[PDB]
Design a protein around this ligand. Structure first.
Ligand SMILES: C[N+](C)(C)CCO
Length: 595
């Protein structure tokens, strides 16, 4: 064995992708532009043309690599993005509201949570995590091994995702505890010896005590990691000039994860508000500096009861993240384990920093930059409570396809147009499989939303229902296509970069405005279903777009909607309202008679 038995990501046929591509964009661009894109595409895919040359190189690439899109995808989707990670990239998972009468209640939670993480990592490292099935065939489990051994280094133009070697798994293993913007190294596993939940508690207390010492308070360096990727790369480059900083950064780069003991939030603890703290900490004046974004998992345990985890996206996606998080939470449910006695307990070490005039300048900039993000985010947690999966399945529809169609109607009734839409589609069936795109703004959806919104047309409800079902069928069809690696985004990306390798001047096929527009997801979505009382959320991917993450339950559907206040067009409240009306309209449509 020693090598995956899983299938390699397939390379869809050239003509299939080009035809689907055109079919996807026809209704999203003018007729004049579409007419030009048809010719451009026709020339790119012609017999003996450039497209076939690139296709052959891709087939060669498919043969020489475990996954032909991994590199291109990782860079295109995240490592090349220059936007600051908060809101723009790193999603957050909000746990249920906790009640911490005292600080020791907060600490005991953190201790229990840290314990859960150690136990989970043990399962991971012992390869005891049950291989996931495609809801089915085996799924790639590589993402799991990137949960605690990943760090994302900033770059001037391209970031670097660092994966720690197994042989280089530190001894002992440690977590970084963030408190009052101060970072402390907390060793948790010496010689296979895992710190007891009781010792972790004791260590956390020492950390809270030290973090509260003004004479030792250091600059809030974590604030720098909340800035644009090129900005952070520059500031980090300054830091690295000194030996003390290199040592501190290294400890952070090699920790298992961060545990953020956030200060109380000066606002009510509604789901929406808790989600905001988890997304950007509320800015420097709050907990915005009590973070370190490059690290994959940042578990937040707020003094006031606001808990959850901030996730860096480059290493793994939402499904794996949820499996982990729900396992931890469930483990915190199971009675406290036995083994917990140990004696000589060294005090946690505070990470030192060698400041300077420069760094102070970078700190001020980052604080201002992060403030713009906090002020620009328009976020809302809307809970649709009229129905959920149960009602939907009774309509012979996949809940996901049904919701994806509702989102299209919501966007159309509000903005009067459909836009290139993104929906994550897992391709974990294939080696190193991450995701591909499900383009939900289909031609069927357009016909459906138009029939619904065009009062003048006076389309009979019975006809609206047929259009509804056809849109849901088209959504399900594209979904199946994407997850079986037969979609088009990854395919076009690879053809694009292989071309770039040949000549920096990309083919007209990719310089075409239709192509550029097709990848500006004004509506970016994903379904992150949970069984616990937690939810995932994230920001939009373009200035004029939304970020819609839904969690469908048997009788309700949770919708986390984001957009930017800077764009006068978008409005999370109005979109959430449009979603409600669409789900109601769809229910009424499905509740009609036959013939
Ligand atoms: C924001 N996206 C939908 C692109 C990714 C969520 O996993």
């Amino acid at each position: 064995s020693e090598e995956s038995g899983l299938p390699k990501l397939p390379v869809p046929p050239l003509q299939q992708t080009l035809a689907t591509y055109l079919q996807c964009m026809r209704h999203l661009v003018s007729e004049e532009q579409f007419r030009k894109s048809q010719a451009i595409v026709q020339q790119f895919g012609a017999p003996g043309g450039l497209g076939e040359t690139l296709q052959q190189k891709l087939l060669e690439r498919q043969e020489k690599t475990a996954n032909w899109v991994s590199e291109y995808w990782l860079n295109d989707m995240y490592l090349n993005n220059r936007l600051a990670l908060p809101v723009n990239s790193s999603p957050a998972v909000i746990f249920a509201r906790q009640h911490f009468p005292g600080t020791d209640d907060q600490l005991r939670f953190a201790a229990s949570l840290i314990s859960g993480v150690l136990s989970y990592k043990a399962l991971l490292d012992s390869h005891s995590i049950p291989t996931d099935c495609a809801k089915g065939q085996p799924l790639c489990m590589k993402q799991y091994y990137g949960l605690f051994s990943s760090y994302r280094l900033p770059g001037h133009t391209q970031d670097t995702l660092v994966a720690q070697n197994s042989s280089i798994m530190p001894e002992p293993e440690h977590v970084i505890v963030a408190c009052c913007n101060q970072f402390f190294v907390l060793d948790v596993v010496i010689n296979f010896r895992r710190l007891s939940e009781g010792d972790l508690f004791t260590q956390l207390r020492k950390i809270v005590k030290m973090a509260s010492n003004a004479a030792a308070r250091l600059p809030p360096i974590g604030l720098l990691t909340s800035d644009g990727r090129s900005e952070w790369a520059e500031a980090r480059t300054v830091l690295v000039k000194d030996s003390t900083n290199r040592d501190s950064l290294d400890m952070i780069e090699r920790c298992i994860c961060l545990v953020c003991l956030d200060a109380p939030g000066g606002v009510e603890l509604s789901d929406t508000h808790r989600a905001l703290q988890l997304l950007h900490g509320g800015g420097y004046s709050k907990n915005g500096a009590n973070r370190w974004y490059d690290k994959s998992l940042q578990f937040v345990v707020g003094r006031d009861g606001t808990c959850g985890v901030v996730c860096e996206h480059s290493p793994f996606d939402g499904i794996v993240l949820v499996q982990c998080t729900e396992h931890l939470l469930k483990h915190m449910t199971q009675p406290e384990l036995v083994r917990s006695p140990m004696v000589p307990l060294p005090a946690p070490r505070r990470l030192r920093w060698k400041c300077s005039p420069e760094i102070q300048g970078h700190l001020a900039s980052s604080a201002e930059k992060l403030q713009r993000i906090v002020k620009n985010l328009d976020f809302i947690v809307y809970k649709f409570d009229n129905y959920g999966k149960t009602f939907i399945k009774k309509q012979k529809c996949s809940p996901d396809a049904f919701i994806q169609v509702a989102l299209q109607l919501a966007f159309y009734r509000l903005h009067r147009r459909l836009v290139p839409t993104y929906e994550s589609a897992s391709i974990r069936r294939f080696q190193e499989g991450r995701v591909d795109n499900i383009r939900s703004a289909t031609p069927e959806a357009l016909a459906f939303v138009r029939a619904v919104t065009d009062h003048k047309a006076a389309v009979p409800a019975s006809e609206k229902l047929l259009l509804l079902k056809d849109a849901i069928r088209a959504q399900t069809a594209y979904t199946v296509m994407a997850i079986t690696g037969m979609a088009i985004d990854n395919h076009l990306l690879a053809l694009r970069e292989l071309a770039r390798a040949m000549c920096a001047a990309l083919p007209e096929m990719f310089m075409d405005e239709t192509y550029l527009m097709s990848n500006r997801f004004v509506l970016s979505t994903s379904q992150v279903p949970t069984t616990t009382e937690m939810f995932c959320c994230y920001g939009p991917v373009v200035p004029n777009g939304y970020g819609a993450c839904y969690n469908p339950q048997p009788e309700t559907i949770l919708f986390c909607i984001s957009s930017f206040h800077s764009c006068a067009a978008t409005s999370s409240s109005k979109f959430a309202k449009a979603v409600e009306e669409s789900l109601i309209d769809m229910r009424d449509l499905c509740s009609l008679l036959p013939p």
